[PDB]
């Protein structure tokens, strides 16, 4: 089943931005030494993404509390992860995240991958716990408490068991562009190695589509599963987790924009320009080039929009002779007929 | 993920409705489809016309809306002896009242009682409170416009994606360096094919460096990439002296 954990305390996190990150291949065609303009939902340049520590030390003593709150899901999410000990293990998607509604789940079962879609009874604090002891042979014994029950699940996937661990600044970073569109679950992913980092560094890398999943379900919310290096029954304070949750992840929300992508001769996306960021970017987009010589260029046309629509016809008149008809004290007979004129 | 033969399906008791918009049925078998959607329901005769792109009516605006750019074929079978009973088959509900019209392929099942007046019904019938979903009195003795019709709309997407449903046309042997009329997974063209040294990403199929012509392609049978060149052409000019000078 599941284990009830402590309160998240609604801790206030810091923030950071994707400095020209998150561009993927929106099409299944190959172009060489071209510049293209694409209308598609991307991650805006220099936009602020919310970053979550895997383990948050409210105090340096070891008051470590997991930081993985529920987050809305609108038009897909960009998910970055910096880590070196596979602390992140998967994600869970749905609308209400219970047996009331259909839901989707991707998890890492110790060394395999699992993809399941049905109406899981997710608990309030789903997690994977792993703990070891030098005595005997424990070596990262695990407890899986992600959901309660699963019924009538349609799609299933299992894979081969393989992943090592430590059971030193080579924090690897993983990028994902999760988007549910047309009943499909496109997962653009990229794995790249970086070293000598504390937060996400500034860099450029095209993101490739790993897999599409036919799920055809309603999705309005999502969560994450983090590998607990501890156990709720005997929770240690410090060093129970991994480097006090220095390894972390970052969540950004995509918006539908236009982008100018530069395919080199090898077909690998090298540079990108966001048209809706700066007047100079608009000039570059309208010139279909990355360098612009000295001069004055006309990009677009600006117009003022009406604020409120107003309709008026002339009410100008007197009240009207109706009360003397309906509210009259006496009424005429049925043969001496009383018609009153109204104008 | 199926090889479909709609030609055999066409010869099915000569059913009246084979209304395919965006595709001709006789040529439908040759063209093949990325995905297929089959949507079924039961309709009345007079409302049959409402199942069409850019059509108005109670069902189009309240029950089932088709896109203005709809591509696909509507098929219907008469169901007088199947769906109609003597006492009336009221198992089918139609939404007569809605707060707003319907987008194409929009099924947002709302059972709320719509408020005809100003007072909120609060899910309670009464004054100016009517339930939208009305049953239908289908009977064998009912009129042709008031009798059941089993309707299935087959919707298709001709996207630039690897097709899954194709008809039983057998692929022939590949020929190289000779100008041919090629048909690669529904992509038809004419030109000369050659061995290309380009590199394709594992999820990339086509290639177009001038934004209108696919210069390269990937064959599904054998994964070798092939680049395509036009079949060559050119004007012909005539060099002549004066006519009476010589011929």
């Amino acid at each position, epitope marked *: 089943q599941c284990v009830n954990l402590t309160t998240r305390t609604q801790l206030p996190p810091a923030y950071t931005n994707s400095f020209t990150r998150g561009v993927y291949y929106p099409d299944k065609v190959f172009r060489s030494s071209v510049l293209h303009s694409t209308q598609d939902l991307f991650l805006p340049f220099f936009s602020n993404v919310t970053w979550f520590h895997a383990i948050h030390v409210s105090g340096t003593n070891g008051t470590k509390r997991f930081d993985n709150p529920v987050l809305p899901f609108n038009d897909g999410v960009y998910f970055a992860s910096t880590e070196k000990s596979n602390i992140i293990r998967g994600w869970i998607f749905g609308t209400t995240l219970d047996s*009331k509604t*259909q839901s989707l789940l991707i998890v890492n079962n110790a060394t395999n991958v699992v993809i399941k879609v049905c109406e899981f009874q997710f608990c309030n604090d789903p997690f994977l716990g792993v703990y070891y002891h030098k005595n005997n042979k424990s070596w990262m014994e695990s407890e899986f408490r992600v959901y309660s029950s699963a019924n009538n699940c349609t799609f299933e996937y299992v894979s081969q068991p393989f992943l090592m661990d430590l059971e030193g600044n080579f924090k690897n970073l993983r990028e994902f562009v999760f988007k549910n569109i047309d009943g499909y679950f496109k997962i653009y992913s990229k794995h790249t190695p970086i070293n000598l980092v504390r937060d996400l560094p500034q860099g450029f890398s095209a993101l490739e589509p790993l897999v599409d999943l036919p799920i055809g379900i*309603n999705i309005t919310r999502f969560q994450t599963l983090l590998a607990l290096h501890r156990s709720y029954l005997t929770p240690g304070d410090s060093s129970s987790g991994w480097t006090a949750g220095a390894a972390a992840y970052y969540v950004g929300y995509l918006q539908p924009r236009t982008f100018l992508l530069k395919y080199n001769e090898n077909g690998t996306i090298t540079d990108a320009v966001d048209c809706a960021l700066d007047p100079l970017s608009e000039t570059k987009c309208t010139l279909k080039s990355f360098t612009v010589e000295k001069g004055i260029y006309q990009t677009s046309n600006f117009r003022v929009q009406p604020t409120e629509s107003i309709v008026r016809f002339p009410n100008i008149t007197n009240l009207c002779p109706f009360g003397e008809v309906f509210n009259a004290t006496r009424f005429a007979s049925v043969y001496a007929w009383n018609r009153k004129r109204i104008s | 993920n199926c090889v479909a033969d709609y030609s055999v399906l066409y010869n099915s008791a000569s059913f009246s409705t084979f209304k395919c918009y965006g595709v001709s049925p006789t040529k439908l078998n040759d063209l093949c489809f990325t995905n297929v959607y089959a949507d079924s329901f039961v309709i009345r005769g007079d409302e049959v016309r409402q199942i069409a792109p850019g059509q108005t009516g109670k069902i189009a605006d309240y029950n089932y809306k088709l896109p203005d750019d709809f591509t696909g074929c509507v098929i219907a079978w008469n169901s007088n002896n199947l769906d109609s009973k003597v006492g009336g088959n*009221y198992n089918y509900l139609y939404r007569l009242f809605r707060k707003s019209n319907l987008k194409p392929f929009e099924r947002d099942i709302s*059972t709320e009682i719509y408020q005809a007046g100003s007072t909120p019904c609060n*899910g*309670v*019938e009464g004054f100016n409170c009517y339930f939208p979903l009305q049953s239908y009195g289908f009977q064998p003795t009912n009129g042709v416009g008031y009798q059941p019709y089993r309707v299935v709309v087959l919707s298709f997407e001709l996207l630039h994606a690897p097709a899954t449903v194709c008809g039983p046309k057998k692929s022939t042997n590949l020929v190289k360096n000779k100008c041919v009329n090629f048909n690669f997974n529904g992509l038809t063209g004419t030109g000369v094919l050659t061995e290309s040294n380009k590199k394709f990403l594992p999820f990339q199929q086509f290639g177009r460096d001038i934004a209108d012509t696919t210069d390269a392609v990937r064959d599904p049978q054998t994964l070798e990439i092939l680049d395509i060149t036009p079949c060559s052409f050119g004007g012909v000019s005539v060099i002549t002296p004066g006519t009476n000078t010589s011929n």
Partner: nanobody
Amino acid sequence: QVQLQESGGGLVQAGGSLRLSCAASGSIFSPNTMGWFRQALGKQREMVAVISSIASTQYANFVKGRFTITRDNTKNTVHLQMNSLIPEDTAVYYCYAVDKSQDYWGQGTQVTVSS
């Protein structure tokens, strides 16, 4: 094929009570809507209550203030509680499962009260 297991009919005197119940044993994809429809001989179908699993009540004015519906989330079963029946209300009730793909109907439960 979703089978609606209807039961709880019979004969009851005026002013009595019953406890109807229908269970959906099908796949039940996505959120569903649970409804009860009243069908009398020589008449059309009039719903009783199409209350969904969440909200919207959906109670008719014909039997307002007398009938209530209880839902069991564990087994996805809805029980139609019956009380203070008036002989005008006697008809055949059918379980109604809306589901996400298509709607289903039960086999009918006979209700007859007279004195």
